[PDB]
Amino acid sequence: TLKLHDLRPARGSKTARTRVGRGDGSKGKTAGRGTKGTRARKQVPVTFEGGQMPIHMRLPKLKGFRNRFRTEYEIVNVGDINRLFPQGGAVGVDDLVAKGAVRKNALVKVLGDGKLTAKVDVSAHKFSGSARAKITAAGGSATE
């Protein structure tokens, strides 16, 4: 039988911790710092480049604003609707949340990647043009 002492970590899962400053045979006196300057006793902030204007100050801000009022859509593609719904049928926001192609409690829009071979009746928010094109081409319907 398998006891508590037949139990063992996976090979390479438990690596040893490097104990610094513990004699000459290992990472010895200076503990890998090697130095006499700032780095010998302190940290240099990532934002500091010795005094020239740093990279985060030489360059211009990215242009534009972010729209406070942006409407974000979860994305489903008719390809993955075909994948998840091979027999077609009624397709709803809740249905493809349940099957896992879209996050819950979000507006979802259908996009036109992939093929549609399923007679599908998809009820989503704000389809794509190619999405409606191939949804109706497969014989289905695309409804808000």
Binding site: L2, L4, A10
Partner: protein
């Protein structure tokens, strides 16, 4: 698969089926090691503390002037190099509980129970004592007829007090509730004995 229920002071009354997808999971040694070490880490209470140089009593003044005394400059009587001074990087109270995922816990449980079932260290019993008054003597005798080796888990429902009291005092006997089953305890025990309702509760809770 087919474990027969043994009655205290008597013969087998029936048998109970032990689902494969739940008592025949392959044993994953690395998984169960992870889960058991997380379990013992959570068991550790971690109330170990020392006192840094700022928490040590006194030590406020610079003990003497920096220059001219011929001594090493010191700054504080409670610096770590002083005897009675602060402890540098000493233990502070810690919580060692880990966040092992639920299905890792569950897989470790099924691996350990499956390992017990696979070489027949799992039994089911109707009761530990046939009566209501708890008796350690009869519980011990019946457990000894059941298994003759030192470390037994007994899984009994919370609503059985007589069996719990009558096995509570035996060395090597560890009592768990079915919802409290865990890899460390099953892996410590070399024999796991369920009551019928405890085992059925475990199977029902695990579908």
């Amino acid at each position: 698969l087919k474990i027969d229920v043994k009655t205290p002071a008597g013969k087998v009354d029936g048998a109970i089926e032990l689902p494969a997808e739940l008592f025949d999971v392959p044993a994953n040694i690395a998984l169960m090691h992870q889960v058991v070490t997380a379990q013992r880490a959570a068991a550790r209470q971690g109330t170990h503390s020392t006192k840094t140089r700022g928490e040590v009593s006194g030590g406020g003044r610079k003990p003497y002037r920096q220059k001219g005394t011929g001594r090493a400059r010191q700054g504080s009587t409670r610096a770590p190099q002083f005897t009675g001074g602060g402890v540098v990087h000493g233990p502070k109270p810690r919580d060692y509980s880990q966040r092992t995922p639920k299905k890792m816990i569950a897989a470790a449980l099924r691996g350990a129970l499956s390992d017990r079932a696979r070489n027949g260290r799992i039994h089911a019993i109707t009761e530990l004592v046939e009566g209501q008054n708890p008796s350690t003597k009869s519980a011990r005798a019946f457990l000894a007829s059941l298994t003759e080796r030192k470390q037994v888990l007994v899984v009994i429902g919370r609503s059985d007090e007589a069996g719990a009291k009558s096995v509570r005092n035996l060395p090597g006997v560890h009592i768990l509730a079915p919802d409290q089953l865990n890899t460390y305890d099953v892996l410590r025990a070399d024999d796991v004995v369920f009551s019928v309702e405890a085992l059925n509760a475990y199977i029902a809770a695990n579908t």
